[PDB]
């Protein structure tokens, strides 16, 4: 869920989701549509296109098992979903982790005036 | 897509999300765990489990038709994914219009510290 999310966020990039990334960009905050605005943006649609990926999870409220181990995340579930939706969150934090370097913060609020040309495609 | 739901809060409360929702409490936030703390929470939690119901479609991509026509918010769509999708953020859109008279700024940011608790069930 978005908690974990957040968290294994915070592990990778210092960063507290709710002040940075939930209002970020076209991807990462509320939009999932118009031009990914950057390295970071295109990170929050890759997940987009990950959670695609399996069919009858929700993501949203998908509590799943994970751990931080040696500053590795490690998912825990031997199921479908659970695993899927925290290997897919697993994937965005390392992404979010690597792109802070051009984390623009120009980019918070974005979508309220922005975010009209066509969407990005998986 | 989230930018569209944005946009049904916008039309039904005049509220950016962005500055409000998008950071509220236990399910309208970085949540999906804890419990709902208000009205408005559980109009967030409600439709998390309204996305669930729906298989074989990734809400963060679904972009929708709507209209917003003279108090009303119109669903276009046939298809199966992006209707239903629509159909939840519209009725969580109007929840949160009917509820806005208890939104508490104190639940702005409450998922850094708190939503630890048993969770709500769909």
Known sequence: ??????????????????????????????????????????????????????????????????????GDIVCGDNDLCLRAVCECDRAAAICLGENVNTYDKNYEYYSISHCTEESEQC
Chains 1, 2 share one sequence.
């Open 1 to 70: 869920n978005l908690f974990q999310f957040g968290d294994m966020i915070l592990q990778k990039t210092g960063k507290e989701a709710v002040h940075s990334y939930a209002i970020y960009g076209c991807y990462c905050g509320w939009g999932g549509q118009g031009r990914a605005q950057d390295a970071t943006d295109r990170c929050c649609f890759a997940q987009d296109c990950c959670y695609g990926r399996n069919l009858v999870c929700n993501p949203k409220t998908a509590t799943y098992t994970y751990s931080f181990e040696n």
